[PDB]
Paper text:
Similar to the two PY-motifs of Dendrin that are separated by only two residues, the first two PY-motifs of PTPN14 are also next to each other with only two residues in between, and the PY12 motif sequence is evolutionarily conserved. We found that the KIBRA WW tandem also binds to PTPN14 PY12 with a super strong affinity (Kd ~8.2 nM). We further showed that KIBRA WW1 had a very weak binding to PTPN14 PY12 (Kd ~32 μM) and KIBRA WW2 had no detectable binding to PTPN14 PY12. Taken together, the above biochemical study revealed that the KIBRA WW tandem, via synergistic binding to the two PY-motifs immediately next to each other (i.e. PY12), can form a very tight complex with PTPN14. A residue in the PY-motif linker (R440 in PTPN14, Q282 in AMOT and G553 in LATS) uses its carbonyl group to form a hydrogen-bond with the sidechain of Trp34. The sidechain of R440 of PTPN14 also forms charge-charge interactions with D17 and D19 in β12 loop of WW1. Second, the C-terminal extension of PTPN14 PY12 tandem enhances its binding to KIBRA WW tandem by forming hydrophobic interactions with its WW1 domain. For example, the formation of the WW tandem supramodule allowed KIBRA WW12 to bind to PTPN14 with an ~3900 fold higher affinity when compared to the isolated WW domains.
WW domains organize molecular assemblies by binding to short, proline rich peptide motifs each with ~4–6 residues. The type I WW domains bind to a consensus ‘PPxY’ motif (where P is proline, x is any amino acid and Y is tyrosine, also known as PY-motif) with very modest affinities (with Kd in the range of a few to a few tens of µM). In this study, we discovered that WW tandems, but not individual WW domains, can bind to target proteins with extremely high affinity and with very high sequence specificity.
Residue numbers in the entry:
A (entry chain U): 434 to 453
B (entry chain A): 6 to 94
The structure:
Amino acid sequence: IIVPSYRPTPDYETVMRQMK
Amino acid sequence: LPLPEGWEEARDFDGKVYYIDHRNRTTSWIDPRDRYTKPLTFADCISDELPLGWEEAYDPQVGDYFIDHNTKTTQIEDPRVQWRREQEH
Ligand SMILES: [Cl-]
Ligand SMILES: [Cl-]
Ligand SMILES: [Cl-]
Ligand SMILES: [Cl-]
Ligand SMILES: [Cl-]
Ligand SMILES: [Cl-]
Ligand SMILES: [Cl-]
Ligand SMILES: [Cl-]
Ligand SMILES: [Mg+2]
């Protein structure tokens, strides 16, 4: 195939919420 | 130097390392300490090192490739090698 596209950092609030 | 206050190291869903700034409620792929330690450009680099904002990563289908966080792009070409062939000319 071809090179993976750029991956954005995870969203701050999403990360804080996913710790449950 | 350790992480500046308010910064926490973390791992993305596939274990890829990033950084959390709790004081500004934001995340970054780049270690804030790189802003001191990393060479500024490809001219500043020795050996196999990469300048500020560049990351080498691996993909099972394509192999190693390169991430430029400065411009939010990816490329298969080795920028250290591009820069060599450019300054040879
Ligand atoms: Cl992809
Ligand atoms: Cl969420
Ligand atoms: Cl949500
Ligand atoms: Cl601050
Ligand atoms: Cl964020
Ligand atoms: Cl970043
Ligand atoms: Cl900082
Ligand atoms: Cl350069
Ligand atoms: Mg809130």
